[PDB]
Amino acid sequence: TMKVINDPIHGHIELHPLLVRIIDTPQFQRLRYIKQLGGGYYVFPGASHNRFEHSLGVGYLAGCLVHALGEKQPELQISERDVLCVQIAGLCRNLGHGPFSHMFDGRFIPLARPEVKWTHEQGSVMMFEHLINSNGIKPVMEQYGLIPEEDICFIKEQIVGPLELWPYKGRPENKSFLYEIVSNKRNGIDVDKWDYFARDCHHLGIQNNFDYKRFIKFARVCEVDNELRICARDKEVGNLYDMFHTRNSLHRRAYQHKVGNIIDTMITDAFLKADDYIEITGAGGKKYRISTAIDDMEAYTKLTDNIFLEILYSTDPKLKDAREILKQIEYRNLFKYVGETQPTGQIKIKREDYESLPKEVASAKPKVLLDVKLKAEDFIVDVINMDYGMQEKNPIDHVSFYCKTAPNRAIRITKNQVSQLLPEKFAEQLIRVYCKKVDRKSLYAARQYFVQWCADRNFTKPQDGDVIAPLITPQKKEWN
Amino acid sequence: TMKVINDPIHGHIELHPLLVRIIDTPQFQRLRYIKQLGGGYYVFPGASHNRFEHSLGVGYLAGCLVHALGEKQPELQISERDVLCVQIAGLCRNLGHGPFSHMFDGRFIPLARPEVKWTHEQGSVMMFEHLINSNGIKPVMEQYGLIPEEDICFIKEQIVGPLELWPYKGRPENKSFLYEIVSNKRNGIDVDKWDYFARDCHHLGIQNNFDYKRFIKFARVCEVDNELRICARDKEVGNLYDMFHTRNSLHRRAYQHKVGNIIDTMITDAFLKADDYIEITGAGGKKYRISTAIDDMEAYTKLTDNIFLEILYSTDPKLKDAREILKQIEYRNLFKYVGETQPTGQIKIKREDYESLPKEVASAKPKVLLDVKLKAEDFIVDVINMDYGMQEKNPIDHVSFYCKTAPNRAIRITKNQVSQLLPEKFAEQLIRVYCKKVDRKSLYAARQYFVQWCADRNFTKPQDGDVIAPLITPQKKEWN
Amino acid sequence: TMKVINDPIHGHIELHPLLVRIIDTPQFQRLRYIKQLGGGYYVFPGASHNRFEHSLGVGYLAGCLVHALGEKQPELQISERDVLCVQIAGLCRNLGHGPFSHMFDGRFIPLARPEVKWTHEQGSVMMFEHLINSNGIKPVMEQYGLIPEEDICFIKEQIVGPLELWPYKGRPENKSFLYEIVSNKRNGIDVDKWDYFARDCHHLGIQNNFDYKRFIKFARVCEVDNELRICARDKEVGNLYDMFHTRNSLHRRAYQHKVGNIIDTMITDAFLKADDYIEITGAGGKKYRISTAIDDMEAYTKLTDNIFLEILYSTDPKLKDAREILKQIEYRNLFKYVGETQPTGQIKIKREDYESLPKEVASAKPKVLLDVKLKAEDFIVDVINMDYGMQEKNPIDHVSFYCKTAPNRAIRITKNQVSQLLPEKFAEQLIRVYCKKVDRKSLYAARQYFVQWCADRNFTKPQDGDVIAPLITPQKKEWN
Amino acid sequence: TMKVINDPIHGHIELHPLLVRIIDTPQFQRLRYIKQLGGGYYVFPGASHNRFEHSLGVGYLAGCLVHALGEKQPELQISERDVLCVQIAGLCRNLGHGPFSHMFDGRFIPLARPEVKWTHEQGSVMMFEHLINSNGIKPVMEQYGLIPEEDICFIKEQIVGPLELWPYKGRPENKSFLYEIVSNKRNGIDVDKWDYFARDCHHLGIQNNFDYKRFIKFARVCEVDNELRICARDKEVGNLYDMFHTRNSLHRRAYQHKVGNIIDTMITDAFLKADDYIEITGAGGKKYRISTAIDDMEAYTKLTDNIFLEILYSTDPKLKDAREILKQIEYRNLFKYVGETQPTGQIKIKREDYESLPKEVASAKPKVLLDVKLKAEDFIVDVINMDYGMQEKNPIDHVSFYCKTAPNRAIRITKNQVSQLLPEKFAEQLIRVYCKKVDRKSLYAARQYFVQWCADRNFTKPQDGDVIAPLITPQKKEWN
Numbered sequence A, B, C, D: 001t002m003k004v005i006n007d008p009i010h011g012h013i014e015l016h017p018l019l020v021r022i023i024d025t026p027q028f029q030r031l032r033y034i035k036q037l038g039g040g041y042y043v044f045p046g047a048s049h050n051r052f053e054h055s056l057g058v059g060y061l062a063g064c065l066v067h068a069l070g071e072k073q074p075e076l077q078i079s080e081r082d083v084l085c086v087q088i089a090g091l092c093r094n095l096g097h098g099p100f101s102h103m104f105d106g107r108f109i110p111l112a113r114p115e116v117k118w119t120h121e122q123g124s125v126m127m128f129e130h131l132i133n134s135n136g137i138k139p140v141m142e143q144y145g146l147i148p149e150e151d152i153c154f155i156k157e158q159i160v161g162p163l164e165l166w167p168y169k170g171r172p173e174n175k176s177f178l179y180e181i182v183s184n185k186r187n188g189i190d191v192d193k194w195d196y197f198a199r200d201c202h203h204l205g206i207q208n209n210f211d212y213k214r215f216i217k218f219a220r221v222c223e224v225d226n227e228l229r230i231c232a233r234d235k236e237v238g239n240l241y242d243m244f245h246t247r248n249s250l251h252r253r254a255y256q257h258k259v260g261n262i263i264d265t266m267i268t269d270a271f272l273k274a275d276d277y278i279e280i281t282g283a284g285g286k287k288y289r290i291s292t293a294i295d296d297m298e299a300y301t302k303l304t305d306n307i308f309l310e311i312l313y314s315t316d317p318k319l320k321d322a323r324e325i326l327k328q329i330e331y332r333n334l335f336k337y338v339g340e341t342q343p344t345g346q347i348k349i350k351r352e353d354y355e356s357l358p359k360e361v362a363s364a365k366p367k368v369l370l371d372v373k374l375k376a377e378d379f380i381v382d383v384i385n386m387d388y389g390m391q392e393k394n395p396i397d398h399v400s401f402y403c404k405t406a407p408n409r410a411i412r413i414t415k416n417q418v419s420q421l422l423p424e425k426f427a428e429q430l431i432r433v434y435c436k437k438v439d440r441k442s443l444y445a446a447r448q449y450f451v452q453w454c455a456d457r458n459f460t461k462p463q464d465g466d467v468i469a470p471l472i473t474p475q476k477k478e479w480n
């Protein structure tokens, strides 16, 4: 019967035997060897935590919220079956993450298999399928009153959305609210965030400005457009705006730390140079690469942060180039950050243009004395899209609220009904430039190119522009 | 010699004997009987803390920062004398607060002595003067190397600004940075905030999004316009914006909680009805009122939260009206919140108009069935100015930064150099309306007046407008 | 309907309307004006907390545990009625505390009304009776399914024990376990402790070594001697020992801090000198003293920490003596701690003997040069009984455990089955001596008397004996 | 110049450039891949932390304490040189740890190379030597005013004790107190503990009962027996006893968790079965085993937790046996805990007897019906020595204290001068028995053997003895 796990964020979590059974598989335990924050550990030494513990946390909160709704509203007829299905989805939405988490689907796969479209969510589903089949979980699900045909569909839909109008098959419109819990496609307000805010802050040594327990206490289900949706108490609208401010602030300080990102980049680089030579045994002894392990779940199961050390410790001279990069990390000879700027007004930059940016920076011609001349391959240019989870859209516009005087009546709240101190935009781009040539003079040069390039493209003045390129900044009137 | 105090926020604080001597006086100990958050305790039961502990905290952080600067830059020639003066100012800037803190100078005095102009800062200075003189502190200051003539001036200036060009007398332009520590008139970034953020969050059960220790580690002094000012590392600019976001959020959730404010109001009302009958003995046996105790520091010394209980426990029928209000608080029959709205576009409301607003709301004529008709005296209207500490101004525009490549060279950073996700405005007004008549029907009515009044004045649509006044909201096109 | 309160220790607590109604009375709200830790605030400035918030906490935890038992074991047939009754007892066990909490029943009443026997528990019951009657709570109890005759008895028994074998009337032997929750007379393991551990640590700035949530998750009810009792999982026995270690450690560092205690003593002294002159209006306009207010609950209601300030701020020269003592506290001219010692071996000291100890210390004749000669009235001697809650008894010997392999079978665990690193004794006495004469030479003398007295009585050598009385310590062989 | 690192336990730590240089080496960065708590991660999912972060913490606290002593007492003439040497020793005392930390030197090496004597301390020294030489650190040490000949000796002595009367060469008797900071051989009170208490509690979700900051504030150096030693303020003696209670409690609940230990045991077993086949390249391409990598630091550098996954992911059938054990861990088919007991009175068990205990348990002949008969190889028996760090000795007897009235005069404090509630013994043994045969009937049998064996050897009655072996416990009178 049921187990208790002590978690520093949530305290003692009770786990239903079915969930234990799911947890105690190689597919799930694999998450113990995948850092939540990837290269962030190398900047924030507190951040040792792995996707495993985060997954328990999500599972538990999913459970908390669904239970709370059932207690508050029996009329919903939430069953233990529904509860466990939501918890399982909670536990399992991180199953698909690869080495160093977002480094893998955010940097490595895009560059190593550009044609394929892949997300950790896709992978979570496949890994889940594989986990169920490989471990005879279906019988156990039935033993506790679950219906695998319907429920496995439901669970997958919770994670990834429809597998193709009410587009969901796993549950009907009257249980629409269950899809809003683990991975909310409508506005991004889900228990996944709540766990990582708390867990990441605890580990990074930053403090979390969002109360998820509070939010659970005020959550109700109401009818909205013939769907039953989760609604938040009206006055909590400020807390929701703050939730996304907090998310943005965590990305600014931690998830997109300039050095954290450059380490992610150097690791990705090394993975690219090892991809040809590393072999991972999949189903039936068949062999895959780092970049193809995503095609066989038995291979993907063995693909974790360990790869990094496999490479670092290798003696094969095939891997000399990859290994040498990782060693530079250890000695802390990293590519050097040059600076940060943003596009101006309407200007927006797409993924297809990314490869051509180092070339543009090298093409800048600053009117300054240069010892060394720098080449496109010497520049790395990271473009980062910061938003409130919905590109240009305001997610609070996609949230339903209920007032105390009419608790069953859903309503909408506009930005102007809340505050004038809110942002007018909800998306932006940051551009970081780094140089692969580390010496004083290369770095000095790189600054001139960079700042010149900003001026050429009419980007925003880097904060330290006047100090790093005092001869370049005067040419631009707007800058001063 | 020196004492150690254990504080839940800062741990063990060391106190120089001179500071102990200052602390162990009636004037200072008085702060033990003054709640930091006033009426907020009646909403947030964690908020039992008094100004006393907050004052130690401020003192300590003042000391931390001044010491840190001296360690980092000996060339500043910060003396122990300077350190103690800053700490004393730190300890003493809350000396002038009255019962329930901001209730007293924010609500009570304005209404009870409208002709006088008064602030707790004014009072801190007078109370400090009184504390020094009444306790023979001057000899002790000299004993530890302080020069009372110069230093007492310095201390007062730190708290209140110039007592009347370099306008400060207590210290020269080369020590300009010492004025920026305890009460920063230039941009509001001071240790007072840092302590209350941490202390209030710990007690309220909210979490603080600002790392003051970090800020202290990155603080340097640089020349700016022939002044030596405290400068912050450039990349910490985001943390500063977040500091004020946090401040605004604390006000939204706690310091301006609608019910917290109404309790402050009811306490103010009771004080008004007792002001004629409560007598407080000042200097030479002379007697004062609650509203006149501010004229004699010996009387003000005895004016604390105790007044509230004096009134509650009184048997004198003179005080029946005041006592009856406090009893309604105990039974939780409070004035009832009707709703909240804001002015539109440019509209701004001054203090002189405040008294006339209940009258405007009563003058609204909603086209709805009314059992009761409500009068101006039945309405309370609270107008709340939310800003980043400098009305319409952005305080980060008044902050100086230094880059890592040129640490002595101060620079400025504009909003656009940081983010497009920042606010476009830095000030706003909230209007809350409450009704003194509590029954169902008076309340129902009050909602109609309120919503009608909003429509009449072209204010923003209250969030729950459609639910509380469904017959009123349709008339306004813009609202729907 | 139900309210949510944000508590820093427990987060958001939900409160049933009935409990709200009980809370929103003058008798309950009174607890807002009574410091949990009395004089400890004057040592630990974090400790601003009042009995009110503690009481909410205890209420909530009582609820948590009773709910957990019902969820785990439906066969117990715990009703909502039972739940609310336990919560009410939880909320209400601190109702009887007087000014500065344990100062009042621990020091003041014993000295001021020696003939009467009184405890805050007695008073909690009376105040509860008074609260129910004075506020028409009985109808509201019936409205929510409670049976006042039985339930009010039950609630009182939970707080104070039997009002006179199964000695309880409010509930039968089959619900015996409900008595173990709020105030466990059998072994002292109850939710009251769990709240104060957490709450006091949070405020004092100390850290709590006991996980009550864990304990709740492992709690079961089992049959023991034809009673149904709460049983703890066997392996949690170490945690229980640690619970009492933590309690003892809190008393050592905080609740019995030498200076905290002396302040309690000086406050008590001032109350004694004011007792004749302070009048408090009880039932029918009849008037009481501080020391007699315990006889009429209407008067006791108005007896709070406020008394302290009433006295401090008084101008009546009747109160000059009392007032002067409080002023010495403010200036921090406190009675001076001389030292601490313990009885040896079997020696135990009774409460009646307390009055004769100052006399013994003054009777010591140390062979040393004395400027001043000290008198019995110049000495204060505080005797403190430190135990695990049950004098000489080990409370874990009165705890029932269950094993995982037979969850319904209760068992006992002896000390030797746990560890040899546990204490061999569970009770002891500390003796502190203070001098009322504060000057260098009186204090120097006092140390000689004290240390001599220790030697005479064959008490333990004070830790600093050799430093304070180097001429006295050599005479005792055992000491060196 | 200097770097700042954000640590969740200590906040922002400043690092001197020299220390950064030491940190940014393969030898130091290796610690990132070694779990502080080894197998405890598999029980406490919060415990993801590695030795790396702990090492920074120790470095920083070493620095805090030495600085504090210098500030308090300039007469000590502590130089920046001394400071950095202490910090380097702090950073580097964990350099020698092997995979899963104490699993490696506590279980694996003892069994795999019984003839060799080895500790992580030995290895820390060797790894340090290797780190200095392999990275040209000596020049950098000289650049900052260090004298490698004297200082490297000093640093090593701090870690391991004398390398062979004042037995230390690195510094004279007048700087004796510097040896007490990083690794205190006299009484075990050092900054290593302080960091792990705080860091481990934060991660395990347990709470730490020891205030190291406080202790640093009250630490002074005094003369004791012609040495200058660190002394603690007398009244802090209780906090020290509590420090060790906390240590013992952490071991009870976490470091010696029965299942955590069994996982360590299964990992060890797998390492043994892989030891023959895993090869690790050391100096000059020469190859070592897991068990011999301790002989060449270049090989040891590459020996980390990674080994575990290397084995788990291997396809080599040489490793089938090792791999199969790790897989049982992943599926959570672990050896089963049977129970725990202790020796009685004087009985003590030496290391030489350990191998023979499974045999004794199998030799027990319980008078009960047995389906299966169990063999010595089916039993694991773990013997755990719990003490206060000094076997039978009380470490507080080896601590020096200073009183407030004579701060330069060291003194001693005995147990009886503190409390009678302290332990009478400071060392004990726990015996845990596990069965490798997991089925119902094997497990049932195992309990009979175990309990019978306890009875035979006159060990303490297992807590659940009566439930698991009701037929066996009656035979022993003492048990009942």
Ligand SMILES: Nc1ncnc2c1ncn2[C@H]1C[C@H](O)[C@@H](COP(=O)(O)OP(=O)(O)OP(=O)(O)O)O1
Pocket: A004, A005, A006, A007, C211, C214, C239, C404, D043, D044, D045, D205, D206, D253, D259
């Ligand atoms: N004393 C403690 N305090 C806090 N957390 C603990 C303590 N002991 C164990 N834990 C943690 C470790 C685990 O994540 C979780 C479960 O541990 P534990 O209760 O010992 O389970 P177990 O499986 O070992 O016991 P059993 O199977 O015998 O019930 O709680």
Ligand SMILES: Nc1ncnc2c1ncn2[C@H]1C[C@H](O)[C@@H](COP(=O)(O)OP(=O)(O)OP(=O)(O)O)O1
Pocket: B004, B005, B006, B007, C043, C044, C045, C205, C206, C253, C254, C259, D211, D214, D239, D404
């Ligand atoms: N063991 C403790 N742990 C944490 N904080 C403590 C402890 N003991 C006391 N404190 C707190 C309470 C006070 O605010 C502050 C100082 O108390 P303390 O150190 O006992 O000074 P004291 O003035 O009582 O002793 P002395 O006058 O003999 O130096 O520290």
Ligand SMILES: Nc1ncnc2c1ncn2[C@H]1C[C@H](O)[C@@H](COP(=O)(O)OP(=O)(O)OP(=O)(O)O)O1
Pocket: A211, A214, A239, A404, B043, B044, B045, B205, B206, B253, B259, C004, C005, C006, C007
């Ligand atoms: N944003 C917040 N975060 C954390 N706690 C909060 C926040 N806002 C309020 N609290 C606390 C203060 C109270 O103790 C508790 C209840 O406050 P609140 O939810 O505002 O009730 P209320 O009575 O004002 O609203 P209503 O009656 O309109 O539901 O929550």
Ligand SMILES: Nc1ncnc2c1ncn2[C@H]1C[C@H](O)[C@@H](COP(=O)(O)OP(=O)(O)OP(=O)(O)O)O1
Pocket: A043, A044, A045, A205, A206, A253, A257, A259, B211, B214, B239, B404, D004, D005, D006, D007
């Ligand atoms: N906003 C933040 N709040 C708290 N900690 C932070 C924040 N930003 C960074 N940190 C942490 C992460 C690192 O462990 C440590 C180093 O900080 P950081 O200033 O990012 O150094 P850096 O090397 O990237 O700056 P630079 O090299 O430009 O001086 O501080």
Ligand SMILES: [Mg+2]
Pocket: none
């Ligand atoms: Mg003292």
Ligand SMILES: [Mg+2]
Pocket: none
């Ligand atoms: Mg850097």
